[PDB]
Amino acid sequence: DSNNIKYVREDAKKMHKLWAHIRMAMEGSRAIKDNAKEFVPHPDNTKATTPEGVARYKAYIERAVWYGASANTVDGMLGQIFARDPVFTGPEDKFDMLINDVDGSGLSIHQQARDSAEDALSLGRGGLFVDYSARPYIKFIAAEDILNWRERWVNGAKRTTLLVFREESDADDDGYQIYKEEVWRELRLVDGTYWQRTWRENDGQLYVDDWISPTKADGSQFDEIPFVIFGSKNNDPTIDMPPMRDLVELNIAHFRNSADYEEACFICGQPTLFLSGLTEHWVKNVLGGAVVIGSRDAVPLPVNAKPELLQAEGNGMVKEAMDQKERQMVALGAKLIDSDKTQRTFGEASMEAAAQNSVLSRVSKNVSDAYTKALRWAAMFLGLDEKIEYELNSDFDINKMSPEELAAVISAWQSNAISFTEMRWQIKKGGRAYLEDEDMRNESEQDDPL
Amino acid sequence: DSNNIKYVREDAKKMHKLWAHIRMAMEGSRAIKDNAKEFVPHPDNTKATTPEGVARYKAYIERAVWYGASANTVDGMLGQIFARDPVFTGPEDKFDMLINDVDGSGLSIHQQARDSAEDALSLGRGGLFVDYSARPYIKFIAAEDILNWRERWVNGAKRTTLLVFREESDADDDGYQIYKEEVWRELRLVDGTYWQRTWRENDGQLYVDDWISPTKADGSQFDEIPFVIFGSKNNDPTIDMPPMRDLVELNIAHFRNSADYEEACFICGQPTLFLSGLTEHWVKNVLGGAVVIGSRDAVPLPVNAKPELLQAEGNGMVKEAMDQKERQMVALGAKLIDSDKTQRTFGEASMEAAAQNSVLSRVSKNVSDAYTKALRWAAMFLGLDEKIEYELNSDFDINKMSPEELAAVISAWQSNAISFTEMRWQIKKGGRAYLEDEDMRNESEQDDPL
Amino acid sequence: DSNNIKYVREDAKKMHKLWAHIRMAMEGSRAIKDNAKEFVPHPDNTKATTPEGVARYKAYIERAVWYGASANTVDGMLGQIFARDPVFTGPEDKFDMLINDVDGSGLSIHQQARDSAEDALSLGRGGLFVDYSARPYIKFIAAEDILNWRERWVNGAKRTTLLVFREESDADDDGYQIYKEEVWRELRLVDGTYWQRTWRENDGQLYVDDWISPTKADGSQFDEIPFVIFGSKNNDPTIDMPPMRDLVELNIAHFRNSADYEEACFICGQPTLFLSGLTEHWVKNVLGGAVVIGSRDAVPLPVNAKPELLQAEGNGMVKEAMDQKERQMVALGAKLIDSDKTQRTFGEASMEAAAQNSVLSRVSKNVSDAYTKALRWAAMFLGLDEKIEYELNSDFDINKMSPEELAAVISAWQSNAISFTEMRWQIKKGGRAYLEDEDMRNESEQDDPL
User: Fold this and answer.
1) Å between C176 CA and nearest CA of chain A
2) How far is B448 from chain C (nearest CA, A)?
3) Do A443 and C419 touch (CB under 8 A)?
4) Contact B76 A333 (CB under 8 A)
5) What residues have CB less than 8 Å from B292, skipping those under 6 apart?
6) How many of the other CB atoms lie within 10 Å of CB of A198?
7) C-beta atoms of A83 and C354 within 8 A
8) Cβ–Cβ contacts within 10 Å for residue C350, how many?
9) What's the gap in Å between the CA of B139 and the closest CA on chain A?
10) Nearest 5°: CA angle at A26, between C68 and A342?
11) Is the alpha carbon torsion for C80, C82, C85, C87 positive or negative?
12) In chain A, what residues touch C259 (CB-CB under 8 Å)?
């Protein structure tokens, strides 16, 4: 237990190891081979003590092959979730500053939502913070940055009273040398009132800021802390298990199996003559420490001499284990790899599509509610309309719409069952239109060319 | 038998072991390898006594591979049950505070329902509590928290008279150090009247609260305790067997088989020369404790010498047992893995879909009735309309609707057989509309663009 | 830490190695075999010390085969992303100078967008800079050129205050000898005002330029630096992991496996007679150091003599490892190779198309927003219309449209659902029209021939 602003909750420290392992898995092969001591055990500790043992271990690690399947799963999941663009409900001209630059850096809200979805898919944690500069800015807080939170029940309700997250920034000094200064934000909720302050560090000194109470345009300060923690499981301050832990462990096991297999292939993969029944006198007489192996020359041997080319044959049990691990990764609901040899009957996958896209749907809804809450807090800051929504693509397995589907949606719009904007969103989802609904209305208002 | 408020029923203590095992199964590989002593038996107790034996056992556990199939089953089951959003029947503006934040934390009722469904699918137990702060809050009580209950028949009826569940909270002290204080709620029913009190602990002292009787807006206090225990089997205080017990045991067995298989692959998987019929004189004369194995060099051997590369071949019976266990997990009605090689004829799975989604349907209905009862209790608290319903997605294997299906539902709506809101719910289930029914009505009220 | 304008950020130096490796992978086989020491380890360090060892290593590298699969993946990804031409939204006559020559070199904006997309697909980094000469020019800055940036938060917003990128140019001296002079651009943002200056080097001397503030046609100088860094992940100054790292490592591993396999094929691939049980007296008597191997002549041998043709058989485990690596590259979502033997059922790939084109879609959107921001900055420079857009082809797997699809889009245009220009863009995407919409309108305005 520590009273410093830098104090990190124990469960966050416990999950730091898994978070770091997942980050190395996402990074690629370089990070895996850098920390290969943690993943691949040394074949012999006695060798590890000696210098030649660690020299051999270095080549053992270098010859290994990293699949990089977890990164492929993350990329495929992001591509499935983020197709076309998330739909925003409500006024658009009154919220254009949030869509164009969500944090005043030129980055659209869609890119920040994509980053949040990637973080929630990979390690299953994130944060969104809304504050006032004038204009409101929607933050993006990495999972490792949120290092403290509290759940104190007020009048029999779940209320998050304390929440401290680390803010990182680059010092803009006169010189071009890159510095690194950190800011700590302390979000407090006393008797249903939001208070906040900032902590800064420089030369080992802690600078404190006076307590302030941000207030909406109408007033009444704030009843809740404008911070939402989104995860794979639910939007709760409690940590959720990352969805990629099992895939990461399977990838590590496959990596060590590949290290063993590559060592075996390097050593015993090359065929060797193995001239048995040979005498030194014969070697010096004819062979002379040199055997011609071309088809032009024939090599003689004495009586009862058996030459036998020896090399490790295929279908080794190490390769069998590697194939089993790859099959398990495919079977673990991961889009990490695709197989051309495998064939699937159409209509079979339609039954399982609900289960396969379970994590996709859960993350999509969680991020949707998180961003809806953030946008509502921003609207409160600006005193704008409250009934706004931000929903990501919840319809996965998206593809170009068929002519029959196009006729069906047109017929549905011609009846009072599908909204005109709903049909436009349908036709944009299928990659059949690009212009905005207002532009299409304006152009179709005039007479036909004929 | 104990008279303390902390007393736990004997059957709860008996089920605690299974609950903990299931929790470790959900957690992932780290928890499994942490408590590997409980799951994987030591290959030799005599070695376990010695230090080198436990040193070998550590590497034995580390080399193992955890499938993580039970977590995949839970995720797939949740994705199947929770598609789109649960439908709420009744006034919506008068219940908006419950939908937006069911417990005053910004968490929507849908997320809490998802968490309850996950708990009922994984270990098959949960609790919902409704209390008054002003506003009513619908609780979520974990299965391990409910530690005492009673079934005393009053006038020949099943009445739950006593129910004590542990309430956990974080102390909001001045410092940032995280504390941990617990609250005990004692729910009592005397002569058909609901009484409740809270118990708090600090510094080993028990603080007691005076008995209170919550009352509805109309009055008449309360006739029943506002607590419902939902499980996989039924909404009864009696404990129900978790649906994932058999899958957890199968996964543990596969994990120990994988430990054995990985040890065998590490040891005997690498091919070895095994130069038989070799004399020490020959070794020192030519070999000199160093054999060149590249294809460039040829190694000679004396007469009657047989070199034989030896390695464990594939299709081992341990691997056969692992494959059998994986097949059994697939066959146990688990969406834990999917196989691209396997092909299924369309229309065959339609016959079994009732049996495969049996646990899904049972959990869906149980949670639906639990949340309906909770919402009715909240309406009683607020004196609102009583004929309200909360039903989750009972139609599993959900996919995008076909153009023919769209035409069919439009034609059905054009007749007096499907409600307009029913057709809207149909078209939203198929991922063909996103706007609310009222918004569509308002936009279609005006004239066509033309 | 250095105060010079040439100072490079530490993370850029760290990523320089991966960037260089990816560049060698794109370059082809010559670059790979040039730096083969970094990729293919020497089979023996003791040999490497000796001159004959390095002589053997040279032939070892020369016999190797480079797949060149990463370059094929990049080319296929570019072809998928860049089909037809990117659509420009807004006035076209007022922006013709940017479309015809984006940087005043006759290179169309489409070619520069293609180059940016290639850079973002290969190593996942790039830059776009807009400056005033008069006319505005949209720059293209290679990833290695951006060597310094800063993220200083101003009023609680992400603002890029410093950004220094290297500008390379060829000296136009009187002679034809090629020189090489470099220019450094220092982009600074003080109190929300864009400042810039240029640094030049000649004969070891640094020439500095006075600080200037570019201003728009309307005025008000500039509020943000007209520089956008686009990457595979997002349009942020932070470096993003290249999407081709895993494929590059797999290709390197396959290259070293191919080196080993080719050496084995060269040495042990040729069959040899291996006349065992042969005496020197017999050799000199009949063989005489010359064996006739044609079918016309028969060669006699003494008693107990076994001739045995020996050669390395097929299905070697090295070849098995190479096949496994090729399969892994195919399965890693790479269009690097296609297999005629493999067959895929139609409709299966439609489900995975979202995941397979994930990196394609992400890069397409990132480059689209980057170029939209650049065009908006150019419009600010010229005081032109701001509501302009530049969107690349986000509909991948593009093919010629079917007659049924043509009828469907015509029917959709005949209704008020698809814009006339939208239908024209549809019919141009399907390769069914080439003339501009205005030309078609002008020709169809007149009466029919009949």
Assistant:
1) 37
2) 10
3) yes
4) yes
5) B299
6) 15
7) yes
8) 15
9) 9
10) 60
11) positive
12) none
3-state SS string for chain A: CCCCCCCCCHHHHHHHHHHHHHHHHHHCHHHHHHCHHHHCCCCCHHHHHCHHHHHHHHHHHHCCCCCCHHHHHHHHHHHHHCCCCCEEECCCHHHHHHHHCCCCCCCCHHHHHHHHHHHHHHCCCCEEEEEECCCEEECCECCCCEEEECCCCCCCCCCCCEEEEEEEECCCCCCCCCCCEEEEEEEEEECCEEEEEEEEEECCEEEECCCECCCCCCCCCCCCCCEECCCCCCCCCCCCCCCCHHHHHHHHHHHHHHHHHHHHHHHHCCCECCECCCCHHHHHHHHCCCCCCCCCCCCECCCCCCECCECCCCCCHHHHHHHHHHHHHHHCCCCCCCCCCCCCCCCCHHHHHHHHCHHHHHHHHHHHHHHHHHHHHHHHHHCCCCCCEEECCCCCCCCCCCHHHHHHHHHHHHCCCCCHHHHHHHHHHCCCCCCCHHHHHHHHHCCCCC
Kind of pairing between the strands at C205-208 and B128-132: unpaired
Chain B neighbours among A 120-149 (CB < 8 Å)?
A: 148
| Cβ pair A272:B171 closer than 8 A | no
| Cα torsion A57, A59, A63, A69: sign | positive
Give me the count of residues in chain A: 450
Residues of chain A contacting B103 with CB distance shorter than 8 Å: 157-158
Find all residues with CB under 8 Å of C172, minimum gap 6, and list them.
Answer: none
Angle at B78 (CA atoms; ends B77, B84), nearest 5 degrees: 120
**Structure-token match 């107790």, residue found:** B45
- Say yes or no: B433 contacts chain A, CB-CB below 8 A: yes
Cβ contact (<8 Å) for A169 and C151?
yes
Name chain C's partners: 3 or more CB pairs within 8 A: A, B
**Is C442 in CB contact (< 8 Å) with chain A?**
no
- Chain B: give the shortest CA distance to residue A340, in Å: 10
Stretch 220-249 of chain B: residues touching chain C, C-beta under 8 Å: none
Binary contact (B294, C56; C-beta < 8 A): no
Q: Which residue has the tokens 């007489």?
A: A285
φ, ψ for residue B299, nearest 5 deg: -105, 125
Task: List CB contacts (< 8 A) between A276 and chain C.
Answer: none
CB pairs under 8 A between A and B: 315
When scoring B296, B313, B400 by the number of chain C Cβ atoms within 10 A, the one with the most, hence best to mutate, is: B296
Here the tokens at position C296 are 């016309």
The rounded distance, in Å, linking the Cα atoms of B243 and B246 is 8
Task: Give C95's DSSP letter.
Answer: G
For residue A33, give both structure tokens: 């081979």
Pairwise CA distance, residues B215 & B136, whole Å: 12
Q: Please give the C-alpha separations between residue C437 and each of B232, C420, C426, in angstroms, as whole numbers.
A: 63, 9, 12
Residue with structure tokens 């510095």? A179
Residue type at C83 in one-letter notation: A
